[PDB]
Every structure is written in C-alpha cells, then in structure tokens.
Write a sequence for this structure.
C-alpha cells in the first residue's frame, strides 16, 4: 500500500536510503519487492556560518544553507552542490546584528538597485 | 553421531547439538546399621489354639535380622500373596517395624480381609485399612481346626451399635438393644446375644470349611530403621563419584563433609522437589552433603561435509579440568572418547572447546559459539579457527563548529526483499 | 533434556519411553528454534549502523550538556550513568535445583558488545545528524542540526538562533530531572521485571511439579523399581511417564506463546529505533508526546530504553482573525 | 473454578484431584492474566485525551 502506490517518507522502511520507487513480483507462497533508492556519494567539505550581516540586519537562508569556498559566499541546497549568488530572494531578514553567535560580514546583491539606477538615469 | 542425529548422509555448515555426557560412578558403598541376633518367626507364627476373631493377638517385632524365605517349611499354604514386596527381595530392605498376627475364620469370607471390604464379617470383626501393605496368607484348616463332635472354641461378634475404627478390637459381651423393648434382662425377644459361635464338622464342604489367616504387616517410615535383612556392610569412600546405599536409600553421586547443623532428632536433609541432600550414617554420627555427579551437553561445530571432514567439539557449561577424567576407561556415557585431551583445549565462558586454535584476530561471525566467540574454517593448510566477533570497522568523524560536508554526486541502487504471504492448506 | 528429566538415569525407564515414540524430539526442536529466534532478535534492534563511529576528544556542543548519556572511560565498562542506574535497578540455591536437565544458555551478544553499538549510535546521531542513516556520514555543527529540526515542524529557524541559551538551559534541566525521575519511583522498570519473574516462576513450578505422584505408589523411580517386581513396576511407572510428558508439553507450549508475544515488541522497538532515532518522525504520538525533536537509545537487561526529546507550546494569547 | 467443575461437590474426588498436583493453578492464573489484559486494552484506545 505504501511503497508501491506512493512515496514513503519513513526512514529505512522501503529500502535503505532515500526512497524512489518499488516494483512487485510474485513467488511461490510469497512476494518479492524491488526497491529503487537514492544514495549520495562523493563529498566535499567547506566552511559555513549561520547568518550574514549586511547593514546591521541578519540574513537567514530561505531554503538551503550558507557556504563559502574561501573568498565569496554562496547558498546551496542540502543534498546536492549547486552554489548561487546571495540575492534578495534567497534570504529573509529577522532581527538586528548582535543576538546571534557566529554571524559573519558580507554583501547581499540587490538585483533591483543597479537595474533601476542605470535605467532611471 | 551428527549424521545419525540428522537422519542424513550430508550435513551443512553450522553448530549442532547431539547428546549428553555423564561421569558414571566408579565403585559402590553400602552401609547398614549394626543388627544383632535373629528373631525366630517360626515360633511366632503358630499358636496352640488360634484365638477367635473377637479377641486376636498381635506381636511387634524389631531389632533382628529379616530373613523371609525360611517360612515355607513351618506353615502349609497355597498362595503367599505378598502384594507389597517381592519375596526374594526382602533380604536387602531395611524396615522400621513389623506386626505379626493370626486368627481363625470361616472360609466363606477369605477375600473379605482386604481394603475396602465391607460386611458384618469384616465391619464388626476385622477390617483392614485402605492402604494395607503386607503378606496375607489363608489356609484351609480342617485337619487341625475341627472335631467330629464339633469344635466350639471359635467365636465372633454379629450385633453391635456401629462400625468399629480400623484395627480396633472389642471384647465386651453385652446384650445388644435391637428393639423397642429395653434390653436390661439377661436374654429374650429383641435382646440378642452379640457373640455367635461357629459350628464346624467334617461333613461341611468348601466355603464352610474353617480357615486360618496369618498376616505379616510391615510399616515403612523415614524413622530410625530397626529391622533389616542379612546383608553385609561395607566401608566408606569420600570425594569420588560412587554409588551409595544408606539404610535402604539407594543413590549415586559425590559425598563431602559439610557444616550442616542437624539437630539430634533430625535425620535426613531435603530441599525443593523432594531431593535428598544429606544423609546420616547408620553407624557413626556424621552428616555429609551429597551432590549429583557432573554432567553436561556436547555440541559439534563442523564446516560443510562437502568441504572437509574435520570437526570441533564443545562441552557446554563444564570446567574442563574434569573432562580428561570424564574421558575414562569405558566409563563415560558417550561411547566415543577418542578426542580426550589431544591438545588445543581452550576455555570459554559458554564451555570448553576442543579442536580449534584461538587467534588474536577479528572477522565477521560465521558459526556462532557464544559469549562473543565465533568459529570458521580458513587458512593461516586449512584449519578451524575460533575468534572474538568483530563489530565493524572503526571510524572517526572530524566534528567542528564551522565545518560542513556536502555531496556532489549520487547513485541509484536497486535492492530486493522477500516476504512470505500464505501457507499450504490442509484437512484431516 | 528428554531422558534425564523424565527418567532418573534409570535403564528400564529409557526402554519403556522408547515405546512411546518420538514425542520429545519435537520438544528438543521447538526450544532450539526459540533460542535461535531470541538470538536473532537483538541483531535487528541494535545492529543497524554500518561502522563504529567515535566522538572527538574535545566535547563542546553549542552549550548543550550530554555528559549524562555519553560513555565515561573511568569505569571498567564504558556505560553511561543512566545505564549504570538502570543496571542496578533491575535485580536479576534456586540454580542448584536445576540438576534434573534444565539449563540456561548464555546469549551470543555480550553486554559490552551492545554498549559499543549504543555508543556508536549516539556519536552518529549527535555528530552527523540523520545523514548517516542513508549514506556516508557528513559532519554538521549541532546548532545547525537543531535549526533544521525546528524547520522540520513548521517553525522558522530564527527562533532557535535568537533563543539558544534558554533552550540549552531547559534541555540540561530536563535531563537532570529525568535522571532522578527513574530512581524516585520503584515501579518505573516493571516490564523487564515481569519478564524475569515469569521465566523464573515457570522454571520453579516445573521443578516443583516434578515431585508429584499422579496416582502411583511413590514419586521416586529408585524406590518403586527396587520395591516391586518388573511386571507391576512398569504398570506403576507408566503413569509417572505420562504425567511428566504432559507437564513438559504444557511448558513448551507456554514458552512458544510467550516468545510469539515478545517478538512483536522486538519488531516495534526495531521500527522505533529506525524512525525516531535515525531521523525525524511526522507520525503523531509515535515518538513521544508532542511535536518530536530527537531521541536517544540506552540498553537495559533484556530491553531498550528511549529518551524522547519533544517540544510543547505554553502561554497562549487570543486575537481576532479574518 | 478448579473443584466445582471436575468434582461435583464431592469429597473423595477432591482428595483424588489433590494427588495429581497443581495443574489447575496455572489454569486459574492464565485466565486472570487474560482478564487483566482485556481490561487494559480499552484504556489505550479511548483514554488518550
Ligand atoms: C571560490 O569561488 C569564486 C567564485 O567567484 C572563485 O572566483 C572565480 O575564480 C575563477 C577562476 O579563475 C575566475 O575565472 C572568476 O573570475 C572568479 N570570480 C570572481 C568574481 O572573481 C574563486 O577562484 C574560488 N576559489 C577557490 C579557492 O576555489
Ligand atoms: C565586520 O565584522 C566585524 C566583527 O565581526 C565588525 O567589527 C566591529 O563592529 C562594531 C560595530 O560596527 C564596532 O563597534 C567595532 O569597533 C568593530 N570592531 C572592529 C575590530 O572592527 C564590523 O563592524 C563588521 N563590518 C565591517 C564593515 O567591518
Ligand atoms: C576450573 O577449575 C580450576 C581448578 O579448580 C580452577 O582453578 C582454581 O579455581 C579456584 C576457584 O574456582 C581458585 O581459588 C584457584 O586459585 C584456581 N587455581 C588455579 C591454578 O587457577 C578454575 O578457576 C576453574 N575455572 C573457572 C572458570 O572458575
Ligand atoms: C558521478 O559518478 C558517475 C559514476 O559513478 C560518473 O560517471 C562516469 O563518468 C566517467 C567520465 O565520463 C565515465 O568514464 C564513466 O563511465 C561514468 N560512469 C558511469 C557509470 O556512467 C560521473 O561523471 C560522476 N559525476 C561527475 C560530476 O563527475
Ligand atoms: C569553535 O571551535 C571549538 C569547537 O569545540 C571551540 O573552541 C573551544 O571553546 C571553549 C569555550 O569557548 C574553550 O574552552 C576551548 O579551549 C576551545 N578550544 C580550543 C581553543 O581549542 C568553540 O566552540 C569555538 N572556538 C572559538 C575560538 O570560537
Ligand atoms: C555538564 O553536566 C555535568 C553534570 O552535572 C557537569 O559536571 C558537574 O560539574 C559540577 C561543577 O563542577 C560538579 O559539582 C558535578 O559533580 C559534576 N558532575 C559530574 C557527573 O561530573 C558539567 O560541568 C557540565 N558541563 C558544563 C560545560 O557545564
Ligand atoms: C576537509 O576535511 C579534511 C579532513 O577530513 C581537512 O583536512 C580539510 O581541511 C577540510 N576542508 C577544509 C576546507 O577545511
Ligand atoms: C556395631 O559395630 C560398630 C562398628 O564399630 C560399632 O561402632 C557399634 O557400636 C556396633 N553396634 C551398633 C548397635 O551399632
Ligand atoms: C504350632 O505352634 C506350637 C507353639 O509352640 C508349636 O509347638 C507347633 O510346632 C506348631 N505346629 C505347627 C507349626 O505345625
Ligand atoms: C560439493 O561442492 C561442489 C563445489 O562447491 C559442488 O560442485 C557439488 O555439487 C557439491 N556437492 C553436492 C552434493 O552438493
Ligand atoms: C595472542 O595473545 C595472547 C595473549 O594476549 C599472547 O599470549 C599470544 O602470544 C598472542 N599470539 C599471537 C599470535 O598474537
Ligand atoms: C480571549 O478569551 C477570553 C475568554 O477566555 C475573552 O474574555 C477575551 O475577550 C478573548 N480575547 C479577545 C481579544 O477577545
């Protein structure tokens, strides 16, 4: 009912790893399931910070995690490596810049400002 | 032995359980009390004139040897119905005490002297208890208990108020009140004399022919034995698995002195499940603990009979400083004893292992012995090796407060899983 | 054992028992099957990690205090204080009476081999999160893992980062109170004691039942064999043989039913350990009362103990909506 | 009940049954265990509020 006719969020129920699909087969006095699952592999480790301070306002990621290769700062999804530039639609602001531990300095690029300053002039 | 157990000519890899081992006893010791003198049963058996039923005699015999095959000459009979004890086995049993008695009755009620038998001839004359155990003898006594003129020394009771208690004798002679007329006079109507007497004549045939009954009645109890048969005593041994006989208490095991503070009246020792624990010597005043002989189970660890032919043996739950002694000259309960102590003997919490060499190594478990010890068949040309189970490969994670690790590549995989769903139907 | 129980090492008793057939072979097979099953039960609950992980020497987790549950190397056995209290709370002449054939085999997985599994699971679940359940373990700082766990139940992640100290204090106080909560009442560990009591009482009643008479002359084989001749001795002992066989059959049937009962609880524990520990559970009232955050496993004699860390709302304010 | 079923309020039947041993004690125990279990069953389905 669960593995075949849908996707299962239960851990280690329908196979080992993140579950993708299942296929049933019949055998004498029994059933056999073929579970198709997803497993990560090659790993790379970087430095992270829980928040970014731009103008005294913290910036927390919308969905993902902050990361840095050493010079710049990117935001990427949890289960795959896909860095992106930190724009205003990847982060949301909450609070001032003194109540968090581990915040680091950076600049958040605003897509509207240069676009509407070059055109308006 | 494993092949016989599995009823097959081929076996697969695994550990199997076959049988048990038990160190059989070496010798035997028999100790009896020191009985002096012989009590002649012949003179006890017979009387000049057998007493009537309303007053029967009884003798209680003790402190003498118990020989019982000699009575075949001093009393004629036909049955010798020794219900309790085999007659030839009486030479060894030790009894507490015994009763002997005899009385004369009519032949119509020979079977009436038995437990559960009712009727005026037994209810008011002589009735046995429901748990009688003796040697009842009945003889047709016409040559010695009859006269042509009619022997009248024989008496019984017929009228009485109510049933008498077991083994009770009433000798009073009072006129029974068997009517509404007050029976204060000597005799008359509705006033019957309780004691009716037999009339015996040779003209009478079977049934009415007088009979004489001789009863030997034992009684057994866990009390100081005073009667025992003609059996020779023996000496004592200690600390060795032997057979022992004490006052008629057969057993087998090891005997060792213990600090048991038995009170003078207390004789035996006992514990849960009615198991004897200590015994008091019939001659000396000493108390000793009794412990059952060492036993155990034997298991066979073997690889597949397809691969090789060697095996390893495991003795479960025994300290194997005594296994070489268990390998004795045709004494051990298993027939095969070739392994004995042929080196490579290892000690384990589960038991003692013979045939495998301990290795300071670690692999995955293949044939599990227990307590973290598993065996396998491998090289080091090919031999059986036992080792401690290995949980897995040790790892260390570089945890830090500003580090993260992200994957960059994935892998699709396919696994299988098998589940039973139904079983074969049947009908009987 | 077949013979050593029914027949008191006699010879004619064995030959008379051979007539009845192969009754005791099924008894010898059923108990072996049960023993194999109970050895396999503990291999599913604990042996779920690929490799034995280890903690770093320096122990600092965002202010959280895990000293009550992580192993302490001072003791000869690497068992945490909670495990030490649990072992003392459960209480494991009576054994000497089991010379009639009854035996107790030792378990395959010894205790420290279980403590190592528990320590590995704790290290994996406080260092790498749930990532080691599926693939290779990936490091991640603990406060970030807590932020993920709040984000998993519909609360934005700024809540944790603005209230780290309060949550740390509440967690430490909760663990401190739960350490004494078990010791305060004596009926906390009732199921495990029920298990041991049932086993011991069944064995005791079997041994006591051994000494009945079943309408025979006596309850001792040696006395009856040396007391009567064979033709009546066999009649006397047939009733004893039948009674003891019936008693053994009752014992094995009860053991089979109890084992079937225990297997279901073992499977439930395996499911809880797979779901609550190696991840976050969305099932309601499954992993504790309230919204679920985390779990910690511990081992106890013939059982497992879960510490569920959960989140519960409190002060309420009511407003108008549209 | 042990006695009332097997023995129809007799006296010798009770003494003969005592010799068999303690068979019916387990019968009296198992039924009590079942009764306690079925009393506990309804406490989990409903008593959750
Ligand atoms: C870290 O990432 C930044 C991303 O910008 C890298 O900077 C770029 O490096 C490439 C390599 O030659 C240049 O072509 C780009 O022009 C750089 N970008 C900018 C904005 O200058 C940087 O090299 C990376 N560092 C490491 C150590 O990987
Ligand atoms: C960059 O980060 C640093 C520290 O992480 C900030 O340095 C302090 O900032 C406060 C508030 O602006 C000042 O009162 C302190 O005097 C600063 N200390 C030092 C050593 O500079 C800094 O403000 C952040 N931003 C920039 C642009 O440097
Ligand atoms: C197996 O038997 C041997 C011989 O008795 C035991 O060795 C002795 O054990 C006693 C107590 O059991 C100690 O007091 C002695 O010091 C031991 N002597 C030696 C030379 O070791 C041995 O302990 C027994 N095996 C086990 C597991 O107890
Ligand atoms: C991710 O892994 C797969 C294989 O695990 C890589 O695919 C291999 O690519 C090389 C180079 O083209 C080929 O020679 C192999 O035959 C490929 N393997 C398979 C199974 O197709 C893939 O390149 C990896 N991803 C990245 C970004 O390198
Ligand atoms: C990040 O690195 C480590 C991670 O555990 C920590 O540094 C320790 O901090 C505590 C208290 O702040 C000190 O008692 C230790 O001496 C530190 N360890 C060292 C210096 O090796 C801490 O979480 C972070 N450290 C810093 C400097 O921010
Ligand atoms: C984590 O909790 C433990 C347990 O309370 C703390 O260790 C205690 O420290 C106090 C003060 O030094 C002692 O009085 C207790 O005896 C300690 N208990 C034990 C079991 O050792 C430990 O200090 C806490 N960690 C931090 C960083 O505060
Ligand atoms: C990644 O981890 C290794 C050790 O596993 C460490 O030496 C290295 O410095 C880490 N990467 C970075 C960018 O710190
Ligand atoms: C029997 O012989 C033993 C052997 O010495 C002796 O001690 C004992 O006094 C004798 N008599 C009795 C009644 O045991
Ligand atoms: C009968 O008993 C008397 C009693 O002394 C005895 O003299 C006589 O020999 C006995 N007769 C037998 C046993 O035939
Ligand atoms: C014995 O093993 C060999 C090799 O593994 C195999 O070919 C052969 O079929 C086996 N014999 C039996 C009877 O299974
Ligand atoms: C194995 O270990 C024991 C004790 O630890 C030692 O006596 C023996 O020499 C070791 N042998 C090998 C081959 O490591
Ligand atoms: C909140 O509830 C109370 C009663 O519980 C009510 O009196 C009050 O008016 C409510 N708040 C508002 C803003 O209506």
């Amino acid at each position: 009912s669960e593995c075949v006719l849908g996707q299962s969020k239960r851990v280690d129920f329908c196979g080992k790893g993140y579950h993708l699909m299942s296929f049933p087969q019949s055998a004498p006095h029994g059933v056999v399931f073929l579970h198709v699952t997803y497993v990560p592999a090659q790993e790379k480790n970087f430095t992270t910070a829980p928040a970014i301070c731009h103008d005294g306002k913290a910036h927390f990621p919308r969905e993902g995690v902050f990361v840095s290769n050493g010079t710049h700062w990117f935001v990427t999804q949890r289960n795959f490596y896909e860095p992106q530039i930190i724009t205003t639609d990847n982060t949301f602001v909450s609070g001032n810049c003194d109540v968090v531990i581990g915040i680091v300095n950076n600049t958040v690029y605003d897509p509207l400002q240069p676009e509407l300053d070059s055109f308006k002039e | 032995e494993t092949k016989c157990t599995l009823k097959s000519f081929t076996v697969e890899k695994g550990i199997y359980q076959t049988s048990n081992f038990r160190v059989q006893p070496t010798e035997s010791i028999v100790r009896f009390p020191n009985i002096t003198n012989l009590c002649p049963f012949d003179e006890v058996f017979n009387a000049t004139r057998f007493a009537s039923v309303y007053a029967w005699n009884r003798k209680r015999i003790s402190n003498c040897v118990a020989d019982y095959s000699v009575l075949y000459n001093f009393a004629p009979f036909f049955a010798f119905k020794c219900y309790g004890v085999s007659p030839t086995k009486l030479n060894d049993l030790c009894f507490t005490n015994v009763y002997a008695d005899s009385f004369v009755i009519r032949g119509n009620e020979v079977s009436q002297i038995a437990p559960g038998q009712t009727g005026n001839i037994a209810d008011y004359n002589y009735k046995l208890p429901d748990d009688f155990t003796g040697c009842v003898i009945a003889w047709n006594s016409n040559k010695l208990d009859s006269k042509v003129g009619g022997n009248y020394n024989y008496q019984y009771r017929l009228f009485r108020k109510s049933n008498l208690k077991p083994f009770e004798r009433d000798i009073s002679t009072e006129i029974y009140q068997a009517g509404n007329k007050p029976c204060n006079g000597v005799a008359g109507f509705n006033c019957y004399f309780p004691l009716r007497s037999y009339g015996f004549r040779p003209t009478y045939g079977v049934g009415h022919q007088p009979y004489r009954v001789v009863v030997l009645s034992f009684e057994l109890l866990h009390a100081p034995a005073t009667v025992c048969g003609p059996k020779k005593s023996t000496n004592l041994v200690k600390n060795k698995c032997v057979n022992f006989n004490f006052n008629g208490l057969t057993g087998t095991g090891v005997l060792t002195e213990s600090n048991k503070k038995f009170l003078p009246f207390q004789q035996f020792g006992r514990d849960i499940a009615d198991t004897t624990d200590a015994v008091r010597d019939p001659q000396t005043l000493e108390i000793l603990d009794i412990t059952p002989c060492s036993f155990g189970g034997v298991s066979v660890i073997t690889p597949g009979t397809n691969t090789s032919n060697q095996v390893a043996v495991l003795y479960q739950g025994v300290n194997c400083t005594e296994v070489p002694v268990a390998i004795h000259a045709d004494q051990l309960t298993p027939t095969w004893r070739v392994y004995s102590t042929g080196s490579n003997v290892f000690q384990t919490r589960a038991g003692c292992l013979i045939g495998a060499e301990y290795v300071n190594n670690s692999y995955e478990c293949d044939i599990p012995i227990g307590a973290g010890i598993c065996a396998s068949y491998q090289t080091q040309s090919q031999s059986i090796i036992a080792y401690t189970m290995s949980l897995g490969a040790e790892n260390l994670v570089a945890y830090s407060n500003n580090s993260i690790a992200i994957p960059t590549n994935f892998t699709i995989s396919v696994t299988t899983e098998i589940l039973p769903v139904s079983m074969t139907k049947t009908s009987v | 054992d077949c013979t050593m129980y029914i027949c008191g090492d006699s010879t004619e008793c064995s030959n008379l028992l051979l007539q009845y057939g192969s009754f005791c072979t099924q008894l010898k097979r059923a108990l072996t099957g049960i023993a194999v099953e109970q050895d396999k039960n503990t291999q599913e609950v604990f042996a779920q990690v690929k490799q034995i992980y280890k903690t770093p020497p320096i122990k600092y987790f965002g202010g959280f205090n895990f000293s009550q549950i992580l192993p302490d190397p001072s003791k000869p056995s690497k068992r945490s204080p909670i495990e030490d209290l649990l072992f003392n709370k459960v209480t494991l002449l009576i054994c000497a009476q089991k010379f009639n054939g009854l035996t107790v085999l030792p378990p395959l997985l010894t205790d420290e081999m279980i403590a190592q599994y528990t320590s590995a699971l704790l290290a994996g679940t406080i260092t790498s999160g749930w990532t080691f359940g599926a693939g290779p373990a990936l490091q991640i700082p603990f406060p970030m893992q807590m932020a993920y766990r709040f984000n998993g139940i519909g609360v934005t992640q700024n809540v944790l980062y603005e209230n780290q100290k309060l949550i740390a204090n509440q967690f430490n106080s909760a663990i401190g109170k739960i350490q004494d909560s078990l010791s305060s009442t004596p009926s906390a560990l009732g199921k495990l004691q029920d298990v041991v009591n049932h086993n011991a009482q069944a064995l005791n009643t079997l041994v006591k039942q051994l000494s009945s008479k079943f309408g025979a002359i006596s309850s001792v084989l040696n006395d009856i064999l040396s007391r009567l001749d064979p033709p009546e001795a066999e009649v006397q002992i047939d009733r004893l043989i039948t009674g003891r066989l019936q008693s053994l059959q009752t014992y094995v049937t009860q053991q089979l039913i109890r084992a079937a009962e225990i297997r279901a609880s073992a499977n439930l524990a395996a499911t809880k350990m797979s779901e609550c520990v190696l991840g976050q559970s969305k099932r309601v009232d499954f992993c504790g009362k309230g919204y679920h955050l985390m779990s910690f496993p511990q081992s106890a004699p013939h059982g497992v103990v879960f510490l569920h860390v959960t989140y519960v709302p409190a002060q309420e304010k009511n407003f108008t909506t549209a």
Remarks:
- DSSP finds three helices and no strands in chain D.
- The radius of gyration of chain D is 17 Å.
- The helical segments of chain D are 2-6, 12-20, 23-45.
